[PDB]
Amino acid sequence: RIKKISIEGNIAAGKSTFVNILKQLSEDWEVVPEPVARWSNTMEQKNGGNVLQMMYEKPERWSFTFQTYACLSRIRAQLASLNGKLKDAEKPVLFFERSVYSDRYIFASNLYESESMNETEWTIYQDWHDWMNNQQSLELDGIIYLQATPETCLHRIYLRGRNEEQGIPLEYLEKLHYKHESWLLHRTLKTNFDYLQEVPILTLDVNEDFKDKYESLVEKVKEFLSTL
Amino acid sequence: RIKKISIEGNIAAGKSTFVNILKQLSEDWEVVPEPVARWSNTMEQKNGGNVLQMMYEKPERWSFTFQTYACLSRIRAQLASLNGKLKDAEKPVLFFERSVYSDRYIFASNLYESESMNETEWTIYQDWHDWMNNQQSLELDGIIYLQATPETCLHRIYLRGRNEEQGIPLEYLEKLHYKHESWLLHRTLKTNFDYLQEVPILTLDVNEDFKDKYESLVEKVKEFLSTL
Numbered sequence A, B: 001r002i003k004k005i006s007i008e009g010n011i012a013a014g015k016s017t018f019v020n021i022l023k024q025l026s027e028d029w030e031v032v033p034e035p036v037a038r039w040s041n042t043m044e045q046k047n048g049g050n051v052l053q054m055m056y057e058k059p060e061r062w063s064f065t066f067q068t069y070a071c072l073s074r075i076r077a078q079l080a081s082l083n084g085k086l087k088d089a090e091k092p093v094l095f096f097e098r099s100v101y102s103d104r105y106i107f108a109s110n111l112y113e114s115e116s117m118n119e120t121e122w123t124i125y126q127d128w129h130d131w132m133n134n135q136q137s138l139e140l141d142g143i144i145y146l147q148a149t150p151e152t153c154l155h156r157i158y159l160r161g162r163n164e165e166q167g168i169p170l171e172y173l174e175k176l177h178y179k180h181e182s183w184l185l186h187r188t189l190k191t192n193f194d195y196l197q198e199v200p201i202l203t204l205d206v207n208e209d210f211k212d213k214y215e216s217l218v219e220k221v222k223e224f225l226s227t228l
């Protein structure tokens, strides 16, 4: 039975970096990169790049369209890996770059909060999400929270160098940080997914650069996985 | 095994009228009214009435949002009936008021054609539709096409008396009529659903009022059903 682990964290915390480290360390370990992340570098990539660029121009027009396609794209990619990969593995683990929960409780929620979605768009989105999900095989065995300060993440957006992201303000990162702390550290965040309240969470501090020095982080991952 | 039959036809052809006749004639016969039709008279009804009113104001803003929610609402309602009803029936038949195919090939397609959706919205919508569907138990055993002239349908919009519909122009009805003829009479319409090319279709002329005189129509339904 494939273990499903979500890697969660703020923008430019180092999730893609970490996930690309993990995938190389075991034949039993596979990754589902986040669709939105792939659109930031096929018909979905063409759709995704258009909707991302339009979002940057007019978030209040495109937020509902972007969020629905981002989440659909994620479910399709996660289900494809779950059904396609790790069939011969001894201790199969599939690492998701973020989850359907971060789609809704971090990003979509923040866009609603910024009035980039109106109430009808936000209620349709949650109804769609509740339905699109409660049809199942994507429920998580655990979450790994890559915890970085907003300033770390701001600095890492500058390091990564995507033109469209250089205007992202610290205040946005602080807002998303607060949301991640409520959800994954304090577990104050109420979701519509009862099992998430009890899902094990491994929090890793990634303020220190780990690209050349990640063995301690991986050791904590291997320990966490053995507990599941 | 429940037989799934779609009732298809132009606006105000008499589908709701016909379906409400059928449901009363047999304990083995159930109906799934069309969500949009219910929104034209719960959280989905609240969402639906808002998005319908916004569509009437600004179709080029709301077409993608409306079409996705209308189709999701339809799938949810059709799956609920399929899983809930006709469990003790001898010859169970579930009559759908329209289908996921009319959502996409009649309405959404026409909104794309009117530039009420841009290419990205239309390509996201078709991707979503292709995916949302190709996950199955809703495939049709047959279609009943209630064929009325545009003028019949225009006259019936006036009879029904919904304020927001009284401005619907004949040209709109002619466009949707042409689409229904291509799909269900000529079968010139190419879809992404191979089985539809071979699905049996019963075409009923409903230009003559049938509310008090429908026995001949029902006889044709019972004959058609016996062939499936």
Ligand SMILES: CCCN(c1nc(-c2nc(N)cc(N)n2)cs1)c1cc(-c2ccc(S(=O)(=O)N3CCN(C)CC3)c(OC)c2)ccc1C
Pocket (backbone or CB within 6 Å): A011, A034, A036, A037, A052, A055, A056, A059, A067, A070, A071, A102, A103, A104, A107, A108, A111, A114, A116, A165, A168, A169, A171, A172
């Ligand atoms: C790198 C971030 C990309 N980005 C986004 N991504 C996601 C996302 N969603 C997923 N489901 C997954 C996933 N991976 N990502 C959602 S939105 C994005 C963000 C903004 C944006 C930034 C900041 C502010 S604000 O709060 O600072 N703002 C206050 C108001 N005033 C007037 C303007 C300033 C914002 O406000 C509306 C929008 C604009 C576009 C884009 C693509």
Ligand SMILES: CCCN(c1nc(-c2nc(N)cc(N)n2)cs1)c1cc(-c2ccc(S(=O)(=O)N3CCN(C)CC3)c(OC)c2)ccc1C
Pocket (backbone or CB within 6 Å): B011, B034, B036, B037, B052, B055, B056, B059, B067, B070, B071, B102, B103, B104, B107, B108, B111, B114, B116, B165, B168, B169, B171, B172
């Ligand atoms: C009773 C019809 C309600 N109606 C609609 N319903 C559906 C629908 N979708 C389902 N998946 C299921 C389902 N049951 N129904 C889709 S849209 C609807 C239609 C219009 C509308 C009417 C006509 C024209 S036009 O082509 O005449 N037009 C040319 C351009 N110029 C400038 C203006 C005139 C139109 O154009 C953009 C839009 C506006 C709102 C609404 C809710």
Ligand SMILES: O=c1ccn([C@@H]2O[C@H](COP(=O)(O)OP(=O)(O)O)[C@@H](O)[C@H]2O)c(=O)[nH]1
Pocket (backbone or CB within 6 Å): A009, A010, A011, A012, A013, A014, A015, A016, A017, A018, A156, A157, A159, A160, A161, A208, A209, A210, A211
């Ligand atoms: O320990 C790290 C982690 C990340 N980065 C850089 O920080 C940026 C953001 O990382 P990533 O793209 O993995 O962030 P994500 O958005 O996927 O969390 C990239 O330029 C990385 O190369 C780094 O230099 N050291």
Ligand SMILES: O=c1ccn([C@@H]2O[C@H](COP(=O)(O)OP(=O)(O)O)[C@@H](O)[C@H]2O)c(=O)[nH]1
Pocket (backbone or CB within 6 Å): B009, B010, B011, B012, B013, B014, B015, B016, B017, B018, B156, B157, B159, B160, B161, B208, B209, B210, B211
């Ligand atoms: O044989 C008929 C069929 C329909 N109608 C009227 O035509 C309108 C449209 O019918 P319905 O709402 O069933 O149309 P749909 O939009 O469901 O095809 C309603 O006012 C019906 O009462 C009628 O008078 N006689």
Ligand code: NA
Pocket (backbone or CB within 6 Å): A022, A023, A024, A025, A026, A027, A028, A029, A030
């Ligand atoms: Na691997």
Ligand code: NA
Pocket (backbone or CB within 6 Å): B022, B023, B024, B025, B026, B027, B028, B029, B030
């Ligand atoms: Na009945």
